[PDB]
Amino acid sequence: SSPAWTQCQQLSQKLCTLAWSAHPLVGHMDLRPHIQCGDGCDPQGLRDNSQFCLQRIHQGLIFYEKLLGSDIFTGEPSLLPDSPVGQLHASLLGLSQLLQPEGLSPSQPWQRLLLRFKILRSLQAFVAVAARVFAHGAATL
Amino acid sequence: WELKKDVYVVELDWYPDAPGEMVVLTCDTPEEDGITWTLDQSSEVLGSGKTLTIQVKEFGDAGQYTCHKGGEVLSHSLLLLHKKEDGIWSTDILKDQKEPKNKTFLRCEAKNYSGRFTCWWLTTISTDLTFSVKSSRGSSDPQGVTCGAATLSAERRGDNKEYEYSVECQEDSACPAAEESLPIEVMVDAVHKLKYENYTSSFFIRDIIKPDPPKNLQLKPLKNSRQVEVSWEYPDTWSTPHSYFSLTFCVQVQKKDRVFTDKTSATVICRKSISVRAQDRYYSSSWSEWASVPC
Amino acid sequence: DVPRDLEVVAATPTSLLISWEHDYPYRRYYRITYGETGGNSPVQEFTVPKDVDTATISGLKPGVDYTITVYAVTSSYKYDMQYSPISINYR
Ligand SMILES: *[C@@H]1O[C@H](CO)[C@@H](O[C@@H]2O[C@H](CO)[C@@H](O[C@@H]3O[C@H](CO)[C@@H](O)[C@H](O[C@H]4O[C@H](CO)[C@@H](O)[C@H](O)[C@@H]4O)[C@@H]3O)[C@H](O)[C@H]2NC(C)=O)[C@H](O)[C@H]1NC(C)=O
Numbered sequence: 001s002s003p004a005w006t007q008c009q010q011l012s013q014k015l016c017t018l019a020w021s022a023h024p025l026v027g028h029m030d031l032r033p034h035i036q037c038g039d040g041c042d043p044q045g046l047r048d049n050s051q052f053c054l055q056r057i058h059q060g061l062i063f064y065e066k067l068l069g070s071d072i073f074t075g076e077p078s079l080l081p082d083s084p085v086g087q088l089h090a091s092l093l094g095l096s097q098l099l100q101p102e103g104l105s106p107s108q109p110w111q112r113l114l115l116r117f118k119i120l121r122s123l124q125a126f127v128a129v130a131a132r133v134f135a136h137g138a139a140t141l
Numbered sequence: 142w143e144l145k146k147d148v149y150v151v152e153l154d155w156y157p158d159a160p161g162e163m164v165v166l167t168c169d170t171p172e173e174d175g176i177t178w179t180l181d182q183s184s185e186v187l188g189s190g191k192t193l194t195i196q197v198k199e200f201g202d203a204g205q206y207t208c209h210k211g212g213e214v215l216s217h218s219l220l221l222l223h224k225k226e227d228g229i230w231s232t233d234i235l236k237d238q239k240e241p242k243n244k245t246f247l248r249c250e251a252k253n254y255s256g257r258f259t260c261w262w263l264t265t266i267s268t269d270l271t272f273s274v275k276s277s278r279g280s281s282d283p284q285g286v287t288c289g290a291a292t293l294s295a296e297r298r299g300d301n302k303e304y305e306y307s308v309e310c311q312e313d314s315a316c317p318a319a320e321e322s323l324p325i326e327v328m329v330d331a332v333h334k335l336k337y338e339n340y341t342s343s344f345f346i347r348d349i350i351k352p353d354p355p356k357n358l359q360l361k362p363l364k365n366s367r368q369v370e371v372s373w374e375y376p377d378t379w380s381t382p383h384s385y386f387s388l389t390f391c392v393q394v395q396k397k398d399r400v401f402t403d404k405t406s407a408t409v410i411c412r413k414s415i416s417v418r419a420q421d422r423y424y425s426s427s428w429s430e431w432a433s434v435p436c
Numbered sequence: 437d438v439p440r441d442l443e444v445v446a447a448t449p450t451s452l453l454i455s456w457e458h459d460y461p462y463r464r465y466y467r468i469t470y471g472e473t474g475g476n477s478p479v480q481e482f483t484v485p486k487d488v489d490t491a492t493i494s495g496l497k498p499g500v501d502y503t504i505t506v507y508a509v510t511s512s513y514k515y516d517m518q519y520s521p522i523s524i525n526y527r
Contacts, residue, residue, distance in 0.1 A: 012423075013422070016422070016423040020424075020425045020461065020462045021461055021462075022462070023462050023464045023510055023511070025464070025511050025516075029511055029513075030512070030513060031512055031513060031514055032513075032514050034319070034322050035318075035319060035320045036319055036320075037316035037319050041318055041319075042316070042317075042318040042319075043318075043382050043384075043385050117513075121515070121516070124424060125320045125321065125345075125424070127423070128347075128421075128424040129318065129319075129320050131387075131422070131423040132318065132385040132386060132387065133385070135384060135387055136382065136385040139384040239469075240520065240521055241518030241520065242512055242518055243512075300475065301473075301475060324514075324515060343514055343515070344515065348515065348517050348518070351520065395439055396455075397440075397457075399457070416439055425460070425517065426517065427519055427520045428459060431439060431441075433439060
């Protein structure tokens, strides 16, 4: 029942670090599934009932692990050796498992490079929300 | 097009050649009698009839058009010019900041996740300027953001004679903890005399965050140790609860000797000076300005 | 402009050797710009790779205040994270 707040806090913090450790875009440039207010991931909401929030976080993590393991990321143009995608994927898996242990297509290469950037940006926002949730829960619950 | 009641913007392809647009003005009245038209303060009759056709080519063609009948003023319309030069709308009024990136005319910053932020811009011009600021989250089903009046905020001899304007905005229904889906759009209408220009910016609050510096920076001697205990607090403006909206810090004694910590304290060897800055612990965004204390 | 994080390490009557500290790992490379403080000169610029924190600014003019700025370039996208520039004024 205790979703191991401390371990979740530590993992979510590492996910935030990884997500900002490298810039996604290559030699490439251009100019041009969300935790909403009703999802109860805000402090007052986590206070009353935390299961809603944690279910929403779990669903988000599964969503991103699926994207990171998809052909958008595996396959050409091949990710650089400095990419944190490998580690990010493993950490998303790691965390989703701590939450519940028991139990739109890439074509042209320029389009995968841009999609990877977009997914990673959106992932940064998501992981930050999760990190604040686990840190508050760890400190107050 | 109408930029407010009785204020029109023309749109001209601006070239030394330019035939400059035919505009049809209509007198607001019922109608078809001894109507005459004048421009600005000149008594020169430009035409008669319920409509007046103008070949708008220069600023001399803009201004206040007034229609009259039987010694009475019927209606008045102000014409402004929006220049398009070599296919791009003019940006003569505002100076380019180049700060986060190039062609940057509007700069926006947020000190916390409350839906409150500030935008600023620069100008060389001091007189006959008006600005109007509007904002919304998204374009499609736009959600309200309320902005205050634009105001001079700083004025920084001639070579360096520049004026800085600013506005403060607040998102109407903000949810600081939520993952933002649609960006905030900011639009500035700028009018210099009879010249119209518009400027726009688009961003997520998370990306414009820059915390204020850490507060109450202090040095406390340690007992059977001979180094100091550096301490500080989160800035008053930062979002609360701090247990959720966490910060990370950098302590520097003066590469130069730098320590990183999530704690609001650190232990260093103070020579004969200590600086601390802050950043969002989980997203990133800009580091705050430094807070210093002499060793 | 007392404490530092971008600093002039060395200097001649026509040059400055500048140095700074890496602060944003999400950087792609650095952009350096320089021009007379009064801003009556154009502002010249050049780039430096991500992993380089030192540069030489040649052909300057003595008795001329120069504003030197350094940016940590991420990208140029409408919604990419854009970090604040850091600058100093010298001579
Ligand atoms: C920033 O600058 C741009 C360029 O000046 C500016 O765009 C212009 O805005 C107006 C209004 O949004 C545009 O007009 C619209 O398009 C057509 C033709 O005018 C019509 O669908 C509408 O016009 C009116 O027509 C009738 C009156 O004549 C009425 O039935 C009614 O009042 C209609 O509204 C419509 O408004 C204009 O075309 C653009 N310009 C370009 C190049 O497309 C933009 O609005 C500025 N931003 C701000 C915040 O003001």
